[PDB]
C-alpha cells in the first residue's frame, strides 16, 4: 500500500484544511449571531418610530369623535 | 508509531468533521429560528408605519401625485 509518508502528508494537509474550516465556521456562527443582534436593534428602532407615528391616527380619531 | 500516526490522523479528521457538522447546524438553527421571524416583525412594523401615514399619502397624492 501507498508509501506511509505520502498517506501521512495527505492526512496532515486534510488536518490543516479542516482546522481552517473549523475556526472559520466558528467565525461564521459568531458573525450570524451578531448580524441577528443588529437586525434586532434595527427592528427595535423601527418599533420606536412606529410608536411615535401611532399618534397620528389617534389625532384623526379625536377629530372625528369631536366632530 | 509509524502506523499509529495514520490512525491518529483518522481520529482527528472524524472529530473535526463532527465539529463542522455541529457548527453548520448551529448556523442553520440561528438563521431559521431568529433572523426570519425578526424580518417578519420588521415588515409588520413597516406596514404599521405605512398605515399610520395613509392620510398624508392621500393629502399629497390627491393634488400633487
Amino acid at each position: 500500500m501507498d508509501s506511509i509518508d505520502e498517506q501521512i502528508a495527505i492526512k496532515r494537509k486534510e488536518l490543516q484544511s479542516l482546522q481552517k474550516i473549523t475556526s472559520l465556521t466558528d467565525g461564521l456562527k459568531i458573525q450570524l449571531t451578531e448580524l441577528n443582534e443588529q437586525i434586532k436593534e434595527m427592528g427595535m428602532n423601527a418599533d420606536s418610530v412606529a410608536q411615535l407615528m401611532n399618534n397620528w391616527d389617534s389625532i384623526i380619531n379625536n377629530i372625528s369623535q369631536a366632530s | 508509531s509509524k502506523e499509529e500516526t495514520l490512525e491518529k490522523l483518522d481520529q482527528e479528521i472524524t472529530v473535526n468533521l463532527q465539529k463542522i457538522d455541529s457548527n453548520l447546524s448551529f448556523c442553520f438553527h440561528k438563521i431559521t429560528q431568529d433572523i426570519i421571524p425578526h424580518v417578519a416583525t420588521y415588515s409588520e412594523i413597516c406596514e404599521r408605519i405605512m398605515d399610520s401615514t395613509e392620510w398624508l399619502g392621500t393629502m399629497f397624492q390627491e393634488t400633487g401625485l
Binding site: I60, I63, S64, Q65, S67 | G57, T58, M59
Partner: peptide, 26 residues
C-alpha cells in the same frame, strides 16, 4: 391596495343619529 377616502375626517353621522333621535323622542 384600495384607495383612501377623499374626506379623511368622516363624521359618524349614522350611529349618533340612530340613537340620538330616539333619545330626543324619549
Amino acid at each position: 391596495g384600495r384607495p383612501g377616502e377623499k374626506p379623511i375626517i368622516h363624521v359618524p353621522k349614522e350611529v349618533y343619529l340612530n340613537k340620538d333621535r330616539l333619545d330626543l323622542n324619549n
